[PDB]
Amino acid sequence: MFEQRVNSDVLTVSTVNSQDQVTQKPLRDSVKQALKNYFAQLNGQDVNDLYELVLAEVEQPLLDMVMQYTRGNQTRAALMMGINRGTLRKKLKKYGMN
Amino acid sequence: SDVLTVSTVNSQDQVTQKPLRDSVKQALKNYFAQLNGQDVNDLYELVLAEVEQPLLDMVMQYTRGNQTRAALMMGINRGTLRKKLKKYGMN
DNA sequence: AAATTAGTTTGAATCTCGAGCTAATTT
DNA sequence: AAATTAGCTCGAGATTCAAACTAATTT
């Protein structure tokens, strides 16, 4: 009665295909594309922060959204994110959202 | 300027970059809409996994399997990297 | 009025880190 | 042969955690 939703189709993005149709592709694939494009524009420059870089690009929208969902309620936001309330306050401060 | 972007296409078949954070934002709005007040619980490990896997995968490809060079690029410890590689069964 | 949340501290537990070593692999 | 990397181990330092609490806010 319940069709399987694989982990990769839980967070998805609208895309356009070779027959000009709108389809949902995983968010992972967006991340793959951002990076292929990041790499292509390196031309041998040194990177030492790729993890923090990516992590930010993802924490900011996540906090942004969960805070809107909870209408500013930090205790609720922490409970649905699955992290300590203090940890959250730390992150909110890090991105100027407190 | 924004280093992490993706390609979008509009109705006039013109292509344009957009920040990766915008995709994430779309994805979450879509997730929240799809659940109607069902409780969300581990949203941080969820997203982090969706992002850490293709990150490891792309960097390992770029360094051709070299874990030591990979960790250096990412700015994390070689142990941490191995640990993450274990976590997602890429070993 | 009661209930919940914000803001804060304290210490325990978990993670991340560099460092250090040898065997295997690449150069 | 020399050089680098993989796979370990061991603390040390940093981070996340849950408890506590009271003031502030929302219900």
Nearest C-alpha neighbor of B27 from the set A90, A84, A64, A76: A64
Tell me, what DSSP letter sits at residue B38? P
Residue B77: CA atoms inside 13 Å, Cβ hemisphere, count? Answer: 3
Please answer yes or no on whether B28 and A8 come within 8 Å at the CB atom: no
| Pairing outcome for strands A12-16 and A22-26 | antiparallel
| Residues constituting chain B | 91
Nearest C-alpha neighbor of B47 from the set B23, B67, B71: B23
Q: Considering only residues 22 to 81 of chain B, which have any Cβ-Cβ distance to chain A shorter than 8 Å?
A: 22-32, 39-51, 53-55, 57-59, 62, 72-76
List CB contacts (< 8 A) between B41 and chain A. 79-80, 82
List CB contacts (< 8 A) between B18 and chain A. none
What CATH number corresponds to the domain at position B17? 1.10.10.60
> In Å, how far from its chain's centre is CA B83?
17
The identity of residue B48, as a single letter, is: L
Residue A2 CB neighbour total at 10 angstroms = 4
Contact between B27 and A61 under an 8 Å Cβ cutoff? The reply is: no
Token digits of residue B61: 């490809």
Domain that holds residue B49: 1-91
Whether the CA torsion A52, A39, B27, B8 is positive or negative: it is: positive
- From the Cβ of B86, is strand D under 7 Å away? no
- From the Cβ of B68, is strand D under 7 Å away? yes
From residue A87, how far is each of A8, A79, A92, B46 by CA, in Å?
26, 11, 9, 17
**Out of B5, B41, B55, closest to residue A82 by CB:** B41
Token digits of residue A90: 């730390």
CA dihedral of A96, A94, A45, B79, whole degrees rounded to 10:
-160
**Out of B30, B43, B50, closest to residue A28 by CB:** B50
The identity of residue A33, as a single letter, is: Q
Q: How far apart are CA B61 and CA B64, in angstroms?
A: 5
List CB contacts (< 8 A) between B59 and chain A. 35, 50
Q: How far apart are CA B3 and CA B19, in angstroms?
A: 8
Q: Does any CB of chain B come closer than 8 Å to the CB of residue A92?
A: no
From residue A98, how far is each of A50, A60, B2, B86 by CA, in Å?
26, 12, 24, 35
The structural domain count of chain B equals 1
